[PDB]
């Protein structure tokens, strides 16, 4: 057939604030998300010249993604699910703490 433009954009409202415009599938889930978040940032740099150099690890082993007191974990049950769409709004949590890591001030 004819394949034009499919998937959605996926913002994440870091948790500081600016958020990043992810892609995924129609039919993607958490587990995706979090690829793409990286494939967002991974694949710029390898375009842009540059070598990875964040700790997705503990990020992901640190922070969720929260959407509206939905709490994306779950990897095996699709966004769709989660009541998350095309053209959504979703930011990071971070686990039960206490205090947190400022930034300015």
């Given at each position: 057939g004819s394949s034009g433009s499919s998937g959605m954009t996926v913002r994440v409202c870091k948790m500081d604030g600016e958020v990043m415009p992810v892609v995924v599938v129609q039919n993607a889930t958490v587990l995706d998300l979090k690829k793409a978040i990286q494939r967002y940032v991974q694949l710029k740099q390898e375009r842009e010249g540059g070598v990875q150099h964040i700790s997705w690890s503990y990020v992901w082993r640190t922070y969720h993604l929260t959407s509206?007191?939905?709490?994306?974990?779950?990897?095996?049950?699709?966004l769709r699910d989660y009541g998350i769409r095309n053209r959504d709004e979703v930011s990071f949590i971070k686990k039960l703490g206490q205090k947190s890591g400022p930034s300015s001030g």
């Open positions: 509206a007191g939905e709490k994306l974990t779950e990897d095996r049950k699709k």
